[PDB]
C-alpha cells in the first residue's frame, strides 16, 4: 500500500530518509573528481558493501501504487568574496583624461578615453573598496596620465564620500571654513569636465549605493554632463580674509600647498569645475537633475542579494513547466534560496581619527597621495563600516514530488541567477524524507 523497498532488505513503511551528501570517502575518490561542491554526484545507497557505481545499479523503490513526495531541507555554506570576478565586482569602466597637450600653436588639446580598471579580488569592507577604486584610477594615471601631459590637478573621476557643501555660505558663495568639512555622509562620485563613469557591467554600483530608478533599462552611465547643478563650491581664502582684518572674502582659494589648481570655472565664479553626484541629487533641480533618474540608497557591501537554485534531476519530478534535460545549465529547479551572505555592521568612531592614525599605521600614504588637495584627498572613513560575511544557511524547501524509483547515484546541482555552477560553495548537502501523497 505504501512500502519502500530496497534490494534485499526488510521493507520499510511510511517514510524514511535518503541522504544527499558530498563528503562520502568512496564516491569522492571515484565519481566526482573534475566536479565541485555545486555540481556533483553522490550515492544515495549508504550501504557499506557494494562498490559505488555498482551501487549505481541498485535503486530505492517507493511503492508504486502511490504518488510520493519528500521534504527537502538543505544545508548550504559558501565563502564568496565581497569583491570578485565571477560576481562582477572586480571591474568597472570609467572615463579619464589620457593626454594634455600644447597643440597647433595656441590650442589646448584634451584627449579623454574610456577604460576598464580591475580590483584585486577579496578586499572587503566598503570604505576600503572605495579606496581600492580611487587607487585604480591613479594606478592608471601612473601608466598613462603623467607621461602624456595631464597633471594631477586635472585627474578626472574620484569616488569620495562627503558633502562638499556643508560650510557653504549663501552670500559668500564659498565654504567659509576654508576646508570641505571632513565628515562622511554617503558615497558619491566626483567628475571633471569631459569624463565620467559607467557600471553597465558591474555590481559595484550597488556598493556605492547609487541605483537607477528604472533598473531594467540596461545601461548605467553617469557622465559629467549629467551631474548638472551641483559643482563643488570653492574654499574661502581663510588666510587672506583673517590676515586682512572691505574684507578679502571674495577670494576663493585657487590652489593649495604643492600648488595644484582647483580648476575654477572662471577668475570670477565661486564654483569649481568639480561636479559631485551627491550634490546633484539633493542640491540640484529635483525635476530635471540626477535625482530624477537615480536613487540614493543604503550601501550594502554584498553588492546585491542574489539567489541560487537547487536541482536534483534524478530524484524529484520536474516542477510544473520545466522540461527534463541533460544540460547542466537548464536542469529543473526544485528550490530557490538566497545566496548565504550578510552585511555585518560595525562601529569605528576610530574612522578619520583612524584615517589620521591609519596613515601612520600603514607605513604609506598610498591611498592619500594628495594630502593637501581638498578634493583628491582621501575620503573620510564613515562610522559604521559594513563587511560581507559568509554564513551557513539551514534552509527548508517544501515537500516535492519524487520518482518512485530513486537511482543509486543522484546528481546535485546548485546554480546561480544566470544559471551556472557557483565556485564559492564549500558545503552543500540535503536530507530528503519521502512520504505518501495519494494513490494511482
Partner 1 sequence: TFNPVYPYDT
Ligand X SMILES: CCCCCCCCCCCC[N+](C)(C)CCCS(=O)(=O)O
Q: Say which entry of its own copies, partner 1, ligand X, none residue 437 contacts (CB below 5 to 8 A, set by partner kind).
A: its own copies
- CB of 334 closer than 8 Å to CB of 312: yes
Residue showing cell 520499510: 12
Task: Fill in the per-residue mask, 193 to 222: x = in contact with ligand X (CB under 6 A), - = not in contact.
Answer: ------------------------x-xxx-
Residues 47 and 88 sit within 8 Å (Cβ to Cβ)? no
Q: Which is nearer to partner 1, 44 or 137 (CB)?
A: 137
| Span near partner 1 by CB under 8 A; candidates 105-113, 117-125, 138-146, 333-341 | 138-146
CA atoms of 44 and 307, how far apart (whole Å): 27
Q: Give me the least distance between CB of 60 and its own copies, in Å please.
A: 6
Among its own copies, ligand X, partner 1, none, partner that 138 touches (CB below 5 to 8 angstroms by kind) = partner 1
Quick check: 275 and 225 in contact, CB under 8 A?
no
d(CA 412, CA 22): 9
Q: From the list 176, 250, 265, 356, which residue makes contact with partner 1 (rule: CB under 8 A)?
A: 176
What are the grid coordinates assigned to 195, written together? Answer: 569624463
Residues 361-380 that bind ligand X (CB under 6 A): none
Binding test (CB under 6 A) with ligand X, winner from 19, 114, 309, 426: 114
Q: Do 224 and 192 touch, CB atoms closer than 8 A?
A: yes
Residue indicated by cell numbers 578679502: 248
Shortest Å distance, C-beta 104 to its own copies? 29
Q: By C-beta, is 71 or 228 nearer to ligand X? A: 228
Would you count residue 223 as binding ligand X (CB under 6 A)?
Answer: yes
Query: How far is 86 from 10, CA to CA, in rounded Å?
Result: 49
Contact call for residue 33 and ligand X (CB under 6 A): no
Query: In terms of CB distance, is 193 or 313 closer to its own copies?
Result: 313
H-type helices in 198-295, by residue range?
204-208, 238-243, 277-283
For its own copies, the binding residue among 57, 101, 200, 214 (CB under 8 A) is 214
Look at residues 32, 30, 101, 42 and name the one whose alpha carbon lies nearest to residue 410: 42
Q: Where are the beta strands (DSSP E) in 18-150?
A: 18-21, 39-43, 59-62, 66-78, 91-103, 107-118
| Burial class of residue 323, CB neighbours in 10 A (0-12, 13-18, 19+) | exposed
293 binds ligand X per the rule CB under 6 A: yes
At residue 24's C-alpha, the angle toward residues 21 and 26, to 5°, is 140
Q: How far apart are CA 70 and CA 317, in angstroms?
A: 11
Query: Which positions from 123 through 182 interact with its own copies, judged by CB under 8 A?
Result: 123-125, 135, 139, 142-143, 147, 163, 166-171, 177, 179-182
Of the residues 146, 213, 221, 344, which one makes contact with partner 1 according to CB under 8 A = 146
- Nearest to ligand X of 19, 426 (CB atom): 426
Residues 179-208 that bind its own copies (CB under 8 A): 179-183, 185-186, 206
Which parts of 61-100 interact with its own copies (CB under 8 A)? 67, 69, 71, 75, 77, 79-82, 84, 90
Shortest CB 146 distance to partner 1, Å: 5
Task: Considering the complex, state which of residue 35 and residue 261 has its C-beta at the smaller distance from ligand X.
Answer: 35
267 binds, among ligand X, its own copies, partner 1, none (CB under 5 to 8 A by kind): none
CB of 191 to partner 1, least distance (A): 20
Contacts of 261 (CB under 8 A, 6+ apart): 153, 154, 254, 255
- Write out the binding residues for its own copies, residues 255-314 only, by CB under 8 A: 278, 281-283, 295-300, 304-307
Q: How far apart are CA 348 and CA 356, in angstroms?
A: 13
Amino acid at each position: 500500500r505504501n512500502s519502500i523497498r530496497y534490494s534485499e532488505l526488510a521493507p520499510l513503511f511510511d517514510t524514511t530518509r535518503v541522504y544527499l551528501v558530498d563528503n562520502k570517502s568512496t564516491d569522492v575518490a571515484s565519481l566526482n573528481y573534475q566536479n565541485d561542491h555545486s555540481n556533483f554526484l553522490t550515492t544515495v545507497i549508504q550501504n557499506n558493501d557494494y562498490s559505488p557505481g555498482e551501487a549505481s545499479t541498485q535503486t530505492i523503490n517507493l511503492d508504486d501504487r502511490s504518488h510520493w513526495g519528500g521534504d527537502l531541507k538543505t544545508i548550504l555554506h559558501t565563502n564568496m568574496p565581497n569583491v570578485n570576478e565571477f560576481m562582477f565586482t572586480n571591474k568597472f569602466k570609467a572615463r579619464v583624461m589620457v593626454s594634455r597637450s600644447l597643440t597647433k600653436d595656441k590650442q589646448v588639446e584634451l584627449k579623454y578615453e574610456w577604460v576598464e580598471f580591475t580590483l584585486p579580488e577579496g578586499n572587503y569592507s566598503e570604505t576600503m573598496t572605495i579606496d581600492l577604486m580611487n587607487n585604480a584610477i591613479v594606478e592608471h594615471y601612473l601608466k598613462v596620465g603623467r607621461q602624456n601631459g595631464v597633471l594631477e590637478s586635472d585627474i578626472g573621476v574620484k569616488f569620495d564620500t562627503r558633502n562638499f557643501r556643508l560650510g557653504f555660505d549663501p552670500v559668500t558663495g564659498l565654504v567659509m571654513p576654508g576646508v570641505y568639512t571632513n565628515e562622511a555622509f554617503h558615497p558619491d562620485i566626483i567628475l571633471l569636465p569631459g569624463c565620467g563613469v559607467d557600471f553597465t557591467h558591474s555590481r559595484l554600483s550597488n556598493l556605492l549605493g547609487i541605483r537607477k530608478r528604472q533598473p531594467f533599462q540596461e545601461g548605467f552611465r553617469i557622465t559629467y554632463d549629467d551631474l548638472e547643478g551641483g559643482n563643488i563650491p570653492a574654499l574661502l581664502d581663510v588666510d587672506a580674509y583673517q590676515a586682512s582684518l572691505k574684507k578679502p572674502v571674495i577670494k576663493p582659494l585657487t590652489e593649495d600647498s604643492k600648488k595644484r589648481s582647483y580648476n575654477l570655472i572662471s577668475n570670477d565664479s565661486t564654483f569649481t569645475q568639480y561636479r559631485s553626484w551627491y550634490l546633484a541629487y539633493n542640491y540640484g533641480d529635483p525635476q530635471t537633475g540626477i535625482r530624477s533618474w537615480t536613487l540614493l540608497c543604503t550601501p550594502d557591501v554584498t553588492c546585491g542579494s542574489e539567489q541560487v537554485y537547487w536541482s536534483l534531476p534524478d530524484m524529484m519530478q520536474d516542477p510544473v513547466t520545466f522540461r527534463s534535460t541533460s544540460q547542466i545549465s537548464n536542469f529543473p529547479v526544485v528550490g530557490a534560496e538566497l545566496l548565504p551572505v550578510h552585511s555585518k555592521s560595525f562601529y569605528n568612531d576610530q574612522a578619520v581619527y583612524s584615517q589620521l592614525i591609519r596613515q601612520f599605521t600603514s607605513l604609506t600614504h598610498v591611498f592619500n597621495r594628495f594630502p593637501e588637495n581638498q578634493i583628491l584627498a582621501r575620503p573620510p572613513a564613515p562610522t559604521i563600516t559594513t563587511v560581507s560575511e559568509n554564513v551557513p544557511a539551514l534552509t527548508d524547501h517544501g515537500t516535492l514530488p519524487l520518482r518512485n524509483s530513486i537511482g543509486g547515484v543522484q546528481r546535485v546541482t546548485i546554480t546561480d541567477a544566470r544559471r551556472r555552477t557557483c565556485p564559492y560553495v564549500y558545503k552543500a548537502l540535503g536530507i530528503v524524507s519521502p512520504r505518501v501523497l495519494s494513490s494511482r
